[PDB]
Amino acid sequence: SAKPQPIAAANWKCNGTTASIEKLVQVFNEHTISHDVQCVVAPTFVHIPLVQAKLRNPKYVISAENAIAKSGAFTGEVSMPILKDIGVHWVILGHSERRTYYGETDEIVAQKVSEACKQGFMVIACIGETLQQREANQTAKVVLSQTSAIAAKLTKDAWNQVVLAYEPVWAIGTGKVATPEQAQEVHLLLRKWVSENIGTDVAAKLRILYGGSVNAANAATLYAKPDINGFLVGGASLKPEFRDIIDATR
Amino acid sequence: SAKPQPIAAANWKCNGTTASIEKLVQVFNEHTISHDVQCVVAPTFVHIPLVQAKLRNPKYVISAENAIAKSGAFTGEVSMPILKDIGVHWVILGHSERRTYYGETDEIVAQKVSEACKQGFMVIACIGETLQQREANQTAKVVLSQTSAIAAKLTKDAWNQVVLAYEPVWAIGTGKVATPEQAQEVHLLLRKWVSENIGTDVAAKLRILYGGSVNAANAATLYAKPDINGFLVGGASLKPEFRDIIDATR
Q1: Which of A18, A46, A93 to mutate against chain B (most B CBs within 10 Å)?
Q2: B78 and A46 in contact by Cβ < 8 A?
Q3: How far is A133 from chain B (nearest CA, A)?
Q4: Residues of A in contact with B65 (CB under 8 A)
Q5: N or C: which end of chain A has fewer CB within 10 A?
Q6: Where is the signal peptide (chains A, B)?
């Protein structure tokens, strides 16, 4: 289909013990990945140094799970210049849980994205609708709303560092995956949107991943859709089966 | 005066480069501390492992600057069980900046405190009034309000792990320190409160620190007050002068 380079990203959320991490990393290192894909591992902040010291599988990069733009008087947070100094140059922003529990709004997400962009980070920005939305046939405008908000703060060239993760709020950690057909419908409308609004050229390289209850048995079917470039995986990433998720992008 | 063991705590907020940290840590390690005081260093999450590997001065402990109670689906955050596994067992909670920018309320602070308590952490809980408060002769009830909220969620014995940091919102990072007399007035009313409400025995061991624009030239005068047990230092802790702040509790 000519698609872009696939992305397989691991989001450990707020989980991990130094022991269990050293176990999973060893399983990941011994997995010979054979095709062109970029694997990404998002550990918690405290665990980032440990992951850097043991992660050796070459198709992998470390990303932070969130950050703030600037260093300063922000107790408890971690900024972007701090993460560059530390060699981490990917970050996941506007992930659902942050939009819901620690109140990050579009414009706020949109600002974290512009700045990371500005800081030379590769960014995976999360968008998606809730079930109430979905049920009001509101899924589409919502996604377009968020993407537009991000887009207003970016330059035509900042897109080269952007990756979108469409995670329907109702599929995250629920066991309730979107059928490939639901997933696929949203990815094409977005691609279409980016295409009309930024450049055909941009929509074609944009990796747009699906996330929300994705596992080793469904990743394959998911991948086969033409506008699905990969995944953002939560629960299944705390397991060896992650191997088989990465291989599904083959 | 018989007072309790003093506390000198360093809060680096969201600042530090691996280089500048390795420089400051070396300055701290070579400072022979001679009296009984517990020094505490709060680095950002990413920097905690680096601090653990180099910090060697024995009167020092590492604390996190914030955390959540439980591990789980909380993207971007770091929990307490994660910090125990990692050997970090002190934490700063309800610091002003968190109460203001990332919306942590009394009850929320009060819950983070009970749980950390429950997790065997030493906790430094922050309370304090804003200038509007101060000007409405509202400083006192406010402090009592917050302390009471914390106290409702703790057991008579949880106090042994609690430390209070009174940081007038108007003195943090402002250059505008509370005179020793303002500081002292608040510490005695609190001590009084804890005394009447929890036990005379408890108020007597409680370390209650002052923080807000505290430096090496004022720490001394600050310390001399009878109900002032130490400090919670922000800006001055990113400097060598921190040495002279620790020595002021002598």
Answers
A1: A46
A2: yes
A3: 22
A4: 75-76
A5: N
A6: none
